[PDB]
Symmetry: C3
Subunit: 627 residues, 3 copies
């Protein structure tokens, strides 16, 4: 009689005036449901967005459900017999387009990731019929895209495709990597071909047919780069030849998003097979019902016996017409022994430009890095991360100068706001290209007042304060320029060879404790004018050889009352309270003139107020006054 | 009669054989007309690009105007009686698609900006029927886009739309953000629906009606970030419940282009209104001459009574056929209870990489910055600005090391060629990323010659001449390495605790004026071999405690003829022209052997030319030779 | 009669049942050959990818040759004698879409680059009929695009076109930018027009015509910038006008991708002239067999005199059907006097973000640069070069300060991995924005193990090893802070004003050889406690002025047995083994008490173990102990 609308609100509540079903491997199904009803104003929103099915009398009397979700709907002007209720029926996955995200995945397999999305969604009606094992993707960020988009890209990359199973009350997103996950139609595993020239045969059969071949590229070369093995060559290449002429045009790519040549070949292969599947296509149109995408069936009756064979349907469509059933269907397929693949046509969220993030790591860490200077960050957009070393993977950082164990070293600290960019805008390839001072990260030299100051102030780690720093500052202030040097605790200046110091004006040197100055060879120095030395304690000179005290004018010695004068003319005056001159052997005293004693000739020698400890110390304390 | 025409080259001269028009709220209109004329060579260019209208014979003989500008035209097939001509009318706003530019706006509301654009255009034919106040865009820029594109984006951002309105001799852009901006045509306050089963009615009526339903998202989350207030959780969310199922899917975006979540909500509301408006669509077809886009009317006669409502036409189709006549129309409308916010369908130019900018400010300034180190810059593409502080807003800049009141920093100067990009390529979110040398701004150490020279050279400010600078110059030249420091002023070497200096060879030191040396505690010095000290003035030793002078081989003192020789063998020789040995108390002169006076045993010890002040001077000036 | 087939699988085996020819200047043709053949199972793959030829009978029996290659071949349900097949004939350039890569072209004219591609693919079937000279570009680059796309784009941007010639067995790509490479249409130098209203005039004439007009812009201003001539005003502008209302709408782009304003003007014209042309075009239809794209002929018979002009066919349509027959043609043209201009409609691969590369240069270099500090790099994506100084053009690099011969200067060396970005994503505008470390280019400080020593390392050049370098480090280690300097050779610290040193604790200086110092004024040295000085050799002080020695407590002189004690009470003890006191004039000795000689009251002063020599030497050796 007719195809009964086995749906919500009853079956007979809706009658199938006409249906246009559409199925495709690796894509969302779509069905036009021209359902009609005795209810002249059946509130459309009551089934809009809800699951429903349709029961098609298949071969053997079996039934094909056309289950999906009412994606869209519309009432249609009609007649007292019935009102039209057009509806677009589509599988759960279109719902994934209704939520966008900016979520980081880390070392997770594609199945893991996708299923996790499903777990997040609460999606259960799906099935894992993969045929190829998967590697965990060390980093994979969902970014400015819907879950649908994200997963779709993961799918095409991996050569994954889907088929959906129609069940009266549900519709299963079946994951498949190959024909082994597919099945023949119930009561229709094989079908005759009865060309249109025969009019019609009651057995479901095919009658329309088309075969076409196309020119394709000779090969695909991919390439990539891994800084951890920088000199390694990751270039790969898939070479395929076809029956057509000139099959010799190579394609090249970089980066291919892989670190092993085996992945390069796998993904090149997935892409190539998707392409190769297009080399020759088979089209069929019949009055068949059982067949659909993801089904395996054998054609028979076609003049070409190389067409009379089993096929895996890639594209399928259905036609139902019922006066208030007529039935047609058309296929687009590949041989049943093939593994369907799709090209990565899903758009890639391109990182349009720079985005900052907070440097993070372990909560008790401050310089969270590794041997490459890579760090973890917290992106401002990542509303789902842990703001720690698990918020992202390690990210390389630019330097002022960077070579083989030489160059600058400014390895980020936690809490810094840094600028992240992506290699060719690819969210999975971050790199730090800058650092920005902000309300927290404030400039060493208060701006704009100290805009003329430049250099660097550090901060001790771990746990150093803003006072605990080493620094260098060059004051540019015209007329008051200045080089400030600050060692927070130590200065080791190594001058491997010769050293030189020049001061245009005055030298102010001071040290809190002791100072040792040893000269490997000789030392010579001079003071242009007066050379004064104050000693708060004692003074001791030790020359192994000869020590010459040379001076023009008068050399003077004063120690309390001990006073000695050494005039340039040799008039040497010596005195104090007493004296004792002694020779263990002989002694001689002579004069050029007369020598007398106990005569009053010699007299006391004036100390000039010198040699007084109190005075000396006063000078010393003036030199070293208290702070 | 038929349809009346009113245009350049003659009103009656052209007869509208047929017309296919289209108007939409917030969008450009288009009228395709086929008119015929007794002029067998009607000059296309004399109406192409020109304003003109149609006087549609409304009820009562009133006329509905369809004024527009001939965007396109064509002499087409026709007859000797009336030659055929075709033309496409478009709005004055459409004309903006013919012009493009690169211009920055700063602190202007969208209404303000657009009206200024209108002033630039001379576009006086518009109305301001907006009820909401709009935020001044502190920075917003037109870049490589048409003026139309630019303002279209501004509108969509703020949700602004409009109603094209016509007058016999002009075309009006009725700017709108409110239902009250729209209105019914005279006699079209309530336009009836007279079923198609009636064929045609004498009263402008509708005969078609269609309603369609669509699944909408359920939540919209927007966010943004402010470095000036880094904890600035600018997250904001709009939510909506819909009649259908699956009315709960969340969306997320960041940055939302706002600094206040409330502004974000405006924007969120603009978007969610634009979105939810797609939930249900109402279509009508009739023979109605008056109601079109931006018009109000109550549907009167549709069998489904809850459709006999007042509607606002979102857009409309206009149809003419003429007997050489019937005017017909189709409406796209929303129920009076609904509002409208322009849908975000216009694309935006993206800054896919770095640009060159000039640091600017006051014309007499060298550093134009604020407390965040931000500066204003001038863009090469912004040919409208005067290369000054008004060229752009305060822009953030990457630095060597951001730190909280510490770090490595260098303040930018006016006239510098800098590397600038945008946050995520968004032209309204500028950020300075670096600096680069050029033909004028040459490297500190001229290349390629000075590739071995590295570090940095500053300049004094204001007035940093080539001489006025401080620098760090490191020489990596193999065999001629160096660590050179230049402090054009004072230099402060602070070492909080311990310091050390290692010199592989010789060390030279020279001070232009005096030297202060204050050893907090004890000083120990030594020279492995010889130590020479010269004094150009006087020397003054002042030791608080005991001052011991030891010489392993000989202590010698010479001041001219004053010569004292202390031989290690115990022989003490003292010579000069005279002596005065005196004890305040007693004294003893004893020998183990014989002591003879005027014996001839004592003589004058050779001074060796020492103590000759002139000789000494020779040595001093040897240390301090001219200049 | 008809169009005869000349092809693979046997010329007359295939019968042109229906052919849809499509031609256009500056665009690849397509001839859809619907053929029927006595071969009931004609191979598809043996036409596919192969050249095929047609011989369309013209007046006089002349055969208009067609030639192209099959991009697609399909088996169409047909009969025995006439089995249907469908072939897509494309021009050779179509095949260039089958290959894609990347590559840099330096100092290459576009004509040459084109020919390079031809040689690469063996595409000898072309004719160089270009008339304008083209710029030798220092840098063009193919990237992620087919060779076809690359060249097509490359041509569009320079105003280059490519035309075609159907030889019988070959199809020639007549490259040309001037109408001298056009021809009269095989003897149809003038083609009469017969109004369709006259009926189908029995001969090869036109039966249709359509002129159409459009509103155009009025001005295009482009601008660009060159840092090597940074004051450049490369801004260009070319203007147009049209018959319609004021064609005065300005356009503006920056950068316009040119370094020469003359070139910029041409580029403006490359866009503009086509835009100008967009104003008016003509469609023609007839059954004219010898006309087609690139043909120049006069239409003769269109009622409007203005249309009986010479026209250049821009594009064309052909339909050939055969009975075993009918022919029709239609075309898009411009007046022969109108200059054909190709718009830049091919997309340019956008550099979505940063790239990685390595600094390269001549093998004898370690640093390869120029007067701008630019470098050559080899790119990690550049899988098509040998990695040398010609692997790129000169590329700029960011710095910490870019001033006029001042600022920062870090120098990249050959072998360093670098970050390369492109201005606004423009593949022809590379710049280095950061240096990075990798497995080979390791970090100078161990990480995280030695992240506390912020700073830098270097290598002497040329030929400096890890032991030959200069380095700076800052220990930020909390509680172990330290500044450290390594001058591999000498060090020079210049302070032009006052220098100061403050060491909070202890300081240790060690000079490898000789130290020399001088004070340009007086000097005030002091210690707060003890001051000891050891001289391993001899010591000599030469004070040109008075030399006063002040000390409290006691002054001691020790040289072997020659020892003097100066007590603060003025008791002066001078003694040893012998003495010789001599006045060269008079001598006086007096006491206030009794002066006795050989009294026994004088004795040898205790040396205190000092003035020994060997012991003293040992002390010095303690001071300067062996390694």
């Amino acid at each position: 009689r007719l195809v009964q609308v086995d749906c919500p609100l009853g079956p007979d509540v809706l009658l199938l005036q006409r249906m246009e079903g559409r199925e495709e491997l690796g894509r969302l199904f779509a069905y036009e449901l021209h359902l009609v009803s005795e209810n002249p104003n059946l509130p459309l929103e009551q089934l809009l967005g809800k699951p429903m099915s349709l029961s098609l009398e298949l071969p053997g009397g079996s039934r094909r459900f056309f289950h999906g979700i009412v994606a869209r709907c519309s009432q249609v002007a009609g007649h007292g017999q019935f009102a039209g209720y057009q509806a677009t029926l589509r599988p759960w996955p279109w719902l994934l387009t209704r939520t966008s995200d900016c979520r980081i995945f880390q070392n997770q397999s594609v199945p893991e990731i996708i299923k996790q999305v499903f777990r997040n969604l609460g999606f259960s009606d799906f099935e894992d019929a993969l045929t190829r094992p998967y590697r965990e993707w060390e980093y994979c960020v969902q970014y400015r895209e819907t879950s649908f988009d994200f997963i779709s890209r993961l799918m095409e990359q991996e050569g994954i495709y889907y088929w959906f199973r129609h069940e009266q009350k549900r519709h299963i997103l079946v994951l498949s990597d190959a024909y082994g996950a597919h099945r023949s139609p119930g009561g229709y595993a094989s079908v005759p071909y009865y060309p249109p020239t025969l009019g019609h045969r009651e057995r479901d059969h095919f009658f329309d047919w088309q075969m076409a071949r196309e020119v394709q590229p000779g090969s695909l070369t991919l390439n990539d780069y891994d800084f951890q093995r920088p000199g390694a060559r990751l270039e790969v290449r898939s070479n395929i030849a076809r029956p057509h002429a000139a099959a010799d045009y190579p394609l090249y790519d970089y980066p291919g998003e892989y670190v092993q040549s085996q992945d390069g070949e796998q993904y090149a292969r997935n892409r190539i097979e998707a392409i190769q599947a297009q080399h020759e296509r088979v089209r069929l149109r019949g009055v068949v019902r059982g067949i659909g995408a993801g089904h395996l069936f054998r054609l028979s009756g076609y003049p070409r016996d190389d067409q009379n064979r089993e096929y895996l349907v890639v594209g399928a469509e259905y036609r139902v017409v019922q006066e208030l059933s007529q039935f047609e269907s058309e296929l687009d397929c590949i041989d049943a022994s093939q593994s369907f693949r799709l090209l990565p046509q899903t758009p890639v969220p391109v990182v349009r430009g720079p985005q900052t993030a907070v440097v993070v790591g372990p909560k008790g860490e401050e310089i969270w890095t590794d041997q490459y200077g890579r760090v973890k960050v917290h992106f401002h957009w990542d509303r789902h991360d842990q703001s720690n070393e698990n918020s992202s993977c390690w990210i390389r950082v630019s330097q002022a100068w960077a070579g083989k164990n030489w160059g600058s070293m400014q390895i980020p600290r936690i809490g810094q706001e840094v600028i992240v960019s992506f290699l060719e805008g690819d969210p999975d390839r971050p790199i730090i290209t800058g650092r920005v001072y902000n309300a927290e990260q404030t400039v060493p030299y208060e701006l704009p007042a100290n805009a003329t100051q430049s250099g660097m102030k550090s901060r001790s780690s771990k746990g150093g304060t803003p006072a605990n720093f080493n620094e260098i500052r060059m004051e540019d202030k015209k007329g008051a320029e200045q080089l400030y040097i600050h060692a927070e605790r130590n200065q080791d200046n190594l001058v491997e060879n010769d050293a030189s110091l020049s001061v245009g004006h005055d030298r102010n040197k001071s040290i809190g404790h002791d100072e040792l100055a040893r000269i490997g060879n000789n030392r010579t120095r001079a003071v242009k004018l007066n050379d004064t030395l104050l000693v708060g304690g004692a003074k001791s000179d030790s020359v192994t050889g000869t020590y010459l005290i040379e001076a023009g004018a008068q050399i003077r010695l004063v120690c309390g009352k001990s006073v000695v004068e050494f005039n340039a003319d040799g008039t040497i005056n010596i005195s104090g309270s007493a004296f004792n001159l002694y020779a263990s052997g002989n002694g001689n005293i002579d004069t050029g003139g007369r020598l007398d004693l106990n005569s009053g000739g010699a007299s006391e020698v004036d100390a000039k107020g010198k040699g007084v400890q109190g005075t000396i110390d006063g000078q010393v304390q003036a030199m070293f006054p208290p702070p």
